[PDB]
Design a binder for this molecule. Structure first.
Ligand SMILES: Cc1cn([C@H]2C[C@H](OP(=O)(O)O)[C@@H](COP(=O)(O)O)O2)c(=O)[nH]c1=O
Ligand SMILES: [Ca+2]
Length: 129
């Protein structure tokens, strides 16, 4: 898998973000994760956390997996990095997202994220408190 450039347009919620990719605006849905909706418990904290991460970044990158790159709603599907650190992983590590929506072909970083979920759960963090 390969990292490609993109720039923040705007933070949306815990697991979606609007980025400019190859010079076009698109909404990205983070692969392999599910944050609570803003309206739910930990939803605001998940939104704040992703927002801070992407807004503080000097360099945003997007990394497509091997499978589908767009979902049925036209959202890009990717791993998103902020100054070299994966947002998808960090959301899970902090107990602000669950590993979710694991579809064969688009699941390269499954193991890595499940490891982070286990540590988050052991610490009883946020969603696991
Ligand atoms: C993360 C992800 C979501 N989706 C779809 C499945 C869900 O369909 P439904 O909307 O029919 O439930 C929806 C969940 O995204 P949200 O968690 O953003 O709602 O997006 C994909 O198709 N592929 C993916 O990799
Ligand atoms: Ca969600």
């Amino acid at each position: 898998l390969h990292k490609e450039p993109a720039t923040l347009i705007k933070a949306i919620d815990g697991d979606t973000v609007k980025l400019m990719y190859k010079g076009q605006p698109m909404t990205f849905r983070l692969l392999l994760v599910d944050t609570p909706e803003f309206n739910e418990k930990y939803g605001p904290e998940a939104s704040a956390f992703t927002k801070k991460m992407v807004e503080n970044a000097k360099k945003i990158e997007v990394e497509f997996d091997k499978g589908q790159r767009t979902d049925k709603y036209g959202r890009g599907l990717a791993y998103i990095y902020a100054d070299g650190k994966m947002v998808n992983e960090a959301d899970v590590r902090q107990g602000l997202a669950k590993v979710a929506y694991v579809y064969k072909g688009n699941n390269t970083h499954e193991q890595l994220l499940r490891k982070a979920e286990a540590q988050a759960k052991k610490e009883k963090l946020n969603i696991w408190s």
